[PDB]
A and B are shown apart, each in its own frame.
With several copies, the nearest count.
Chain A
Amino acid sequence: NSVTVRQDLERQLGELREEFNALSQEIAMSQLIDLALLPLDMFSMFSGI
């Protein structure tokens, strides 16, 4: 029974694009290929989400 707290905002989509572009180096090759080999689905996508 308190006044509703102001909902938080979201990180700017431009900053999101900058961060995702900068994250390029930290990716392995063979492990990524083997992960792409494994099929995914709606339940497997958000396991850590």
Chain B
Amino acid sequence: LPITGSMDIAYALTSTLCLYYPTEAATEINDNSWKDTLSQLFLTKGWPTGSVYFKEYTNIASFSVDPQLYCDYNVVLMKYDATLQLDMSELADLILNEWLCNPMDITLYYYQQTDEANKWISMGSSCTIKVCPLNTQTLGIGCLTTDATTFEEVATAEKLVITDVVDGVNHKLDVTTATCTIRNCKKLGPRENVAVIQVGGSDILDITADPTTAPQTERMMRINWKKWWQVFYTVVDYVDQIIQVMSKRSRSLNSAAFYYRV
């Protein structure tokens, strides 16, 4: 709907905050009441008491299992390593973006792509995704329609895979439909309710499959560390900027999932 205002007239909380931390921080701090200390620090900062929830994840891969967050304002601390950058980028792109998915099945249907705003998402314990294209008359090229060995590998021993292939061609997929489920999702736009704080070194986190584009938005932040309490203090004492850099939900067709909005 149109908005009508003016440019010459002088024109000028009750939200939720979730902090996501690795369990290694909990192991290192060696305390049980530090949640109370953080709550009281937030209360001093100007947040209401009993209005902050903390969620813990065992591992990066484990947290990649249905990562749907349940806060209006979200900031997640992500571990740093140089041997798992792909999965970190996958998680960042799945969290920072909004997606609308559809159910799929591999043993009965064929699938294809037609727009670059649609990709394949498989989530679960482990997804051994294998795929090869077809021709118009449904004959395998570099593969046989029944042989599961000649199928090219695109994902092995992965807990969360975001795959994209050449559009406009039907494809056949093979995976064990008892350990991982696949869905067809489209990128509707930006998800402004979340932010990622990469606690570590240089950033390789790419939020797009297009090579020519390297979007470095203001919703991605990087910081070095040697003690977890330093990171926690920096996060708590600087809520204003990390909150004003984000906004509320812009979704036109909301999903069905749990939410924590006190």
Contacts and interface: CB of A to CB of B under 8 A. Distances in A.
**Direct A/B contact, Cβ within 8 angstroms:** yes
A10 interface: yes
A12 B139 contact: no
A7 interface: yes
A39 to B, nearest CB: 34
Interface residues of B, number: 9
B137 interface: yes
B102 interface: no
Contacts, number: 21
A7 B136 contact: yes
Main secondary structure of the interface of A (DSSP, over half): loop
A21 B238 CA distance: 51
Interface in B38-55: none
Main secondary structure of the interface of B (DSSP, over half): loop
Interface in A1-38: 4, 6-10, 12-14
Contacts of A12: 167-168
Contacts of A14: 114, 167-168
Contact of A6 (B114, B141, B167): B141
B249 to A, nearest CB: 31
Nearest to A11: B168
Given A13-B114, A13-B168, 13 more contacts: A4-B139, A6-B139, A6-B141, A7-B136, A7-B137, A7-B139, A8-B135, A9-B135, A9-B136, A10-B136, A10-B168, A14-B114, A14-B167
Interface of A: 4, 6-10, 12-14
